[PDB]
Amino acid sequence: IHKIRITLTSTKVKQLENVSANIIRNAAQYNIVKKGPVRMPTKVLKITTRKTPNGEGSKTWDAYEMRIHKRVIDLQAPASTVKRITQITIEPGVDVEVTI
Amino acid sequence: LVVQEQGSFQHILRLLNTNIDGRIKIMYALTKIRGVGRRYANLVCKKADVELTKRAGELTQEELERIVTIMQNPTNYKIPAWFLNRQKDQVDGKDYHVLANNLESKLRDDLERLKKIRSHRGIRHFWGLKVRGQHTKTTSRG
Amino acid sequence: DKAQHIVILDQEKYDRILKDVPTYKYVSVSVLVDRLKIGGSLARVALRQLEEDGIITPVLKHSKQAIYTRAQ
Amino acid sequence: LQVVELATTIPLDVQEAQREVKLFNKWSFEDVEVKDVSLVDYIQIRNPVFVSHTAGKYASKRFRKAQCPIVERLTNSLMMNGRNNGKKLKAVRIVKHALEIIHVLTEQNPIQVVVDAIVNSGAREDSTRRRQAVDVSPLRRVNQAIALLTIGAREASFRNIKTIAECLAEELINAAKGSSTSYAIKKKDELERVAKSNR
Amino acid sequence: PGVSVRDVPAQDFINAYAQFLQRQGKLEVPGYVDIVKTSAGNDLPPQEAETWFYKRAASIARHIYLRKQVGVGALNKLYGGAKNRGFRPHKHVDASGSINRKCVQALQKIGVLEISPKGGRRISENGQRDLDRIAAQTLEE
Amino acid sequence: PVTLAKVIKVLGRTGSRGGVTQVRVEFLEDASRTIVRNVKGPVRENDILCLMESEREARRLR
Amino acid sequence: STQSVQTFGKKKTATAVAHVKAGKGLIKINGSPITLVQPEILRFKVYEPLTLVGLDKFQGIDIRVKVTGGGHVSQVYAIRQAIAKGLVAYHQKYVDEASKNELKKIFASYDKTLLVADSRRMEPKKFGGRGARARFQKSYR
Amino acid sequence: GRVRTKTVKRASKVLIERFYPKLTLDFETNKRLTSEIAVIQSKRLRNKIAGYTTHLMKRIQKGPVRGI
Amino acid sequence: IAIYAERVEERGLSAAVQAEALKAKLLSGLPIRRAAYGVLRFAMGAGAKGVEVVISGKLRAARAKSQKYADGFMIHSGQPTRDF
RNA sequence: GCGAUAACGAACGAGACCUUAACCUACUAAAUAGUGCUGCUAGCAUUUGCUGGUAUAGUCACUUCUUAGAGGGACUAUCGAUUUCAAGUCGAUGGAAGUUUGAGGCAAUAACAGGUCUGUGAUGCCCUUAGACGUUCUGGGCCGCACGCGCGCUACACUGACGGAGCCAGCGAGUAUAAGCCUUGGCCGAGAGGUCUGGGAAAUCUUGUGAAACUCCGUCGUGCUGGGGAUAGAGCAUUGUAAUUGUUGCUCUUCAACGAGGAAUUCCUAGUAAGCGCAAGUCAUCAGCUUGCGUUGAUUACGUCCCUGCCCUUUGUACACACCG
């Protein structure tokens, strides 16, 4: 019984939602009381740069973007069982941090 | 409160050292003196116990002379060393709030100091060009 | 510099101000300035005075517009 | 009559406002009517408003602007020459003080004076590019009238000790009586005289 | 009716509390109030020479009352304004730190403000009473 | 004297820049007369229009 | 808890959250009464939803609207919309439907933005000029 | 303008040829019917096709229609 | 870290592989048209919906030209370009 | 698109699409959002009321407002009209929304001797390669001023300037044994700034970014005036190894031209234009610049082919380097 906090953040929403659903399921069936998920406001990383590699022509601009999403869930259970739940439920697109 | 009053109304266009018009409020009439600004005149008129709602004509000789003394002896009336002019005088190191004819005397002195030593700023004053590093390619036509 | 206004309240002028202002349906800073050749800093205080010792009554009060009508 | 009590004290002059709607809680609309049959539909005074500021959407369609309250149109046209673009609180205050000053000078409903200045000020024939005499539509008549009145007042107040509200009141009353002292009648007279020669 | 500051218009409340604070007398008005500007972005000193400090302190006390834990930098931000920068465009500048700090220190020694936990200054029990009573008198008339 | 007339049909836009509109005005009191006239502003049907002198007919302009 | 509804009102970024509960006719703005709401030229905007329907509808209810965001004019419009919608919502949840329809009808017949929010929002600014539509000044030779 | 392109019009014609009996003169019923029958990649296109199908069914009842 | 290798599922549906192969045959002195049509045939065999090969530079002459070699179906605008 | 049809079936572009804005008391939730209550408590009147602080252990509840997945919604829906009665179009009604609902990203074929070899360890050929055209250090220059021009910022004032008071956004960014980030609060200093703490790798702290225009109350009073603040003298600070050719900031003093701008000429159709600031980029220092963002918020069209051009058809041509022929 620890107040474990998991924080999920990734640039691609499908996999992040899959990870949040997986932890919700593996904290449900393994009967643990859970307090989420909670969605932080999305972060839009904007780089606006000139299209031309020289300085000629009409002044036209590109607006590139990298979105970031962040979800948090709080778990109330022993440390090792939540650790194993986190360890099985990974994905290349979505990085994790378990903290107390 | 409006007051009916006469006699003391001298519209005399002659005031201290220069022809300061009497129709203008005292805070700003002193700004005619070269060396005195709105804020310096405002602070002097405060230190001389002159209600600023009184016009330059409405004043009398006691206020005039107190203003002269407070303007020419700023320290003696608690004017801070940062509020006056020509701080740390180049000649003697004192704080001198320089006024009308001394103002031109000291400007001539500073400029001639710069020219005699052959400083770049003095040489540019000599040519009539801007000294503070501004561009003159396009905007010094006048 | 023109328009040669009046810079102080004066006895003859004060007789003028007392005599003429009850014949005005509308008085304000501008009305006094252009029917008295006084300045504005005098017109404002004349309106205030005549407000205390009643000679002019107000319709509206504002910093930028003073509206004043006949006392009667 | 309608007095009724609340935990927070409500001003009494506000309680007087349940019976009718009045401009600045001082001027009534229902006693104002338009003398010109042609201009009745393009001067909207039928729907009372408390203040000449409604944030309406009047640029959407073509004639939707004719349904704006006329005092609001005058207020908007006070908002000009760059420095005064956007400052509509100042404009509505100008209009309110002008209505007061009009009532003081002229023992009439100031809305009526505004309507009369607007109906007198608009040229009925004009010229279009050699130029040819043409007639003027009612809506053009109305908004040419408003533009003329506001431009005349704004010209008068510039570099003059007289306030903008007083210049506005002066222009409106001079137009409302149809005298050549106003800026709007003078310009209307010019426009119709020129349209005369072009027939 | 239980009167508070929120029930009275601001302008006349700051006026009344400043007249009270100057009538009362004990407030520690500093000696440089005849020489200084309120803001570096300002150009001229306050016109009301003999009262501006009292009206500043009254508005400051009302500001503290209406809130929780507001310090001297936030008052510096509050009382600042646009600066005339000549040919450059206008820009916000903060107000004078010494003035606002001396005002809050005078209000604190008269027992109106008090150092709060979490930092800053918050209104006092007697400060709340004084502000509330000076609000009650204003709305009585 | 000025007469009054009501637009009963909008024929079309005219002028080189299109700033004038052809309308068929119709007298209020003397309902048996219809005159074609040019108008500078925007006009709908039923727009009552004031004519300085009604004894003139217009066809086109550029 | 006896009777309470919650509504909202918007003008472009400003949002006014109103709580309408049973009470002795109290109307409040961020803890201060409506009678001293700023710009006073626009005060009759926040008096309209009161006069147009009669104050008696506000005898039984006690309304505290919290307004945040936007600007002064936008907040005035958001407050008026919140108050009107809140009265209608209370007559929906407790009082009969005929009265609620009558109030909705009168509100709509006077002004549409008492019940329905103005959907206008600021158009995004595009490169090549200082505004949504305005373009940089173009030169030749 | 609101001219409906070839994609919606052809899809509507195919729908009416195939599934005329189970298709009505109401936009909501036809919307659900198109959703179950057609694999439309966007809801906007789905609504446009359903509405044009409703228009054609509403025209047919008064008399036959070319192409269909 | 741990680096592994896996072969490509369709050599002809990979544009990178085809571009590298076209580089190789072009470096090998093989004619430009033959190499481009080799790319096109190979990709169409792998089942692609369409394929385009564009070769630019100075071809046998001082002036630089651009030769295009299309086959099949190709879209240009909208979101589906990023997908397919 | 309807359709006409010596074609018939197709492919690209358009449209679909994607991102974003507007609606949802309809799902899922929230101790990094907010709230109703409840403890403990303030002042003010005692009706059990009005405004607050506090408690991220109160072993409470919730989701209107905030956040964001998962959906719903608009399709011209209804009604009048008109038109091959086909495609459409115009008015109303309802609706959050009825211009393709608003804004963008994406974007065919053919081309230009358009720009870029000074973004590239992208490059052929030429040149140079030890007194170098490589590289590095010191100092200067890129700012140099009779003059012409382009993008702009301040203004010429009273719809204002100054002084007090009121007091409201939105998009964003942020570090550690530094070469050093965002900085609250406390203290000193007129200021600019200095100092000591503490929070924040961030829906948690800066930050409600208490922004500016604006609103109120006074002072000024039609004049180059308290409009304007260039140029200049003196002094104080900060960044930097280094401020002279003022880096920048602050204080006093100096107080120009300009009184609305000739011929010409730019941009713009609604939350738009104009006004007003703010953040990010550049960045040790410096923003009168760009890119976005909100605040206040209009006048006038909703039309035409006159001017400047664009598209399609017919037609003439001695043009094809294509009428700048």
UniProtKB/Swiss-Prot annotation, chain A:
Chief place where the protein resides: cytoplasm
GO cellular component term of the entry, any: cytosolic small ribosomal subunit
Compartments reported by the entry: Cytoplasm
Keyword Transferase: no
Function: Component of the ribosome, a large ribonucleoprotein complex responsible for the synthesis of proteins in the cell. The small ribosomal subunit (SSU) binds messenger RNAs (mRNAs) and translates the encoded message by selecting cognate aminoacyl-transfer RNA (tRNA) molecules. The large subunit (LSU) contains the ribosomal catalytic site termed the peptidyl transferase center (PTC), which catalyzes the formation of peptide bonds, thereby polymerizing the amino acids delivered by tRNAs into a polypeptide chain.
Entry keyword set: Cytoplasm, Ribonucleoprotein, Ribosomal protein
Organism in which the protein naturally occurs: Candida albicans (strain SC5314 / ATCC MYA-2876)
GO molecular-function terms, A-Z: RNA binding; structural constituent of ribosome
Assembly information from the UniProt record: Component of the small ribosomal subunit. Mature ribosomes consist of a small (40S) and a large (60S) subunit. The 40S subunit contains about 32 different proteins and 1 molecule of RNA (18S). The 60S subunit contains 45 different proteins and 3 molecules of RNA (25S, 5.8S and 5S).
Name the UniProt record assigns to this protein: Small ribosomal subunit protein uS10
Family to which this protein belongs: Belongs to the universal ribosomal protein uS10 family.
Organismal lineage: Eukaryota, Fungi, Dikarya, Ascomycota, Saccharomycotina
Origin superkingdom: Eukaryota
UniProtKB/Swiss-Prot annotation, chain D:
GO CC annotation: cytosolic small ribosomal subunit; membrane; ribosome
SUPFAM superfamilies, per the entry: Ribosomal protein S7
Localization terms from the record: Cytoplasm
Family matches, as Pfam families: Ribosomal_S7
Keywords: Cytoplasm, Ribonucleoprotein, Ribosomal protein
Superkingdom field: Eukaryota
Molecular function (Gene Ontology), one example: mRNA binding
GO BP annotations listed: maturation of SSU-rRNA; ribosomal small subunit assembly; ribosomal subunit export from nucleus; translation
InterPro entries documented for this protein: Ribosomal_uS7, Ribosomal_uS7_CS, Ribosomal_uS7_dom, Ribosomal_uS7_dom_sf, Ribosomal_uS7_euk/arc
Major location (coarse): cytoplasm
Function: Component of the ribosome, a large ribonucleoprotein complex responsible for the synthesis of proteins in the cell. The small ribosomal subunit (SSU) binds messenger RNAs (mRNAs) and translates the encoded message by selecting cognate aminoacyl-transfer RNA (tRNA) molecules. The large subunit (LSU) contains the ribosomal catalytic site termed the peptidyl transferase center (PTC), which catalyzes the formation of peptide bonds, thereby polymerizing the amino acids delivered by tRNAs into a polypeptide chain.
Subunit structure: Component of the small ribosomal subunit. Mature ribosomes consist of a small (40S) and a large (60S) subunit. The 40S subunit contains about 32 different proteins and 1 molecule of RNA (18S). The 60S subunit contains 45 different proteins and 3 molecules of RNA (25S, 5.8S and 5S).
Record-stated family: Belongs to the universal ribosomal protein uS7 family.
Gene responsible for this protein: RPS5
From Swiss-Prot, chain E:
Cellular component aspect of the GO annotation: cytosolic small ribosomal subunit
Main subcellular location: cytoplasm
Subcellular location: Cytoplasm
InterPro entries per the UniProt record, alphabetical: Ribosomal_eS19, WH-like_DNA-bd_sf, WH_DNA-bd_sf
Stretches the record annotates as Disordered: 119-141
Any one GO BP annotation for this protein: ribosomal small subunit assembly
Family matches, as SMART domains: Ribosomal_S19e
Keyword set, alphabetical order: Cytoplasm, Ribonucleoprotein, Ribosomal protein
UniProt xrefs under Pfam families: Ribosomal_S19e
GO molecular function, a single term: RNA binding
Extent of Basic and acidic residues compositional bias: 122-133
Top-rank taxon, per record: Eukaryota
Cross-referenced SUPFAM superfamilies: Winged helix' DNA-binding domain
Keyword field contains Magnesium: no
Subunit architecture: Component of the small ribosomal subunit. Mature ribosomes consist of a small (40S) and a large (60S) subunit. The 40S subunit contains about 32 different proteins and 1 molecule of RNA (18S). The 60S subunit contains 45 different proteins and 3 molecules of RNA (25S, 5.8S and 5S).
Family recorded in the similarity comment: Belongs to the eukaryotic ribosomal protein eS19 family.
Function: Component of the ribosome, a large ribonucleoprotein complex responsible for the synthesis of proteins in the cell. The small ribosomal subunit (SSU) binds messenger RNAs (mRNAs) and translates the encoded message by selecting cognate aminoacyl-transfer RNA (tRNA) molecules. The large subunit (LSU) contains the ribosomal catalytic site termed the peptidyl transferase center (PTC), which catalyzes the formation of peptide bonds, thereby polymerizing the amino acids delivered by tRNAs into a polypeptide chain.
Identification of the protein by name: Small ribosomal subunit protein eS19
Curated annotation (Swiss-Prot), chain G:
Cellular compartment(s): Cytoplasm
Primary location recorded for the protein, binned into one broad class: cytoplasm
Keywords of this entry: Cytoplasm, Ribonucleoprotein, Ribosomal protein
GO biological process, one term: maturation of SSU-rRNA from tricistronic rRNA transcript (SSU-rRNA, 5.8S rRNA, LSU-rRNA)
Record-linked InterPro entries: Ribosomal_Su5_D2-typ_SF, Ribosomal_uS9, Ribosomal_uS9_CS, Ribsml_uS5_D2-typ_fold_subgr
Taxonomy, superkingdom: Eukaryota
SUBUNIT field: Component of the small ribosomal subunit. Mature ribosomes consist of a small (40S) and a large (60S) subunit. The 40S subunit contains about 32 different proteins and 1 molecule of RNA (18S). The 60S subunit contains 45 different proteins and 3 molecules of RNA (25S, 5.8S and 5S).
Similarity section: Belongs to the universal ribosomal protein uS9 family.
Protein name according to UniProt: Small ribosomal subunit protein uS9
Source species: Candida albicans (strain SC5314 / ATCC MYA-2876) (Yeast)
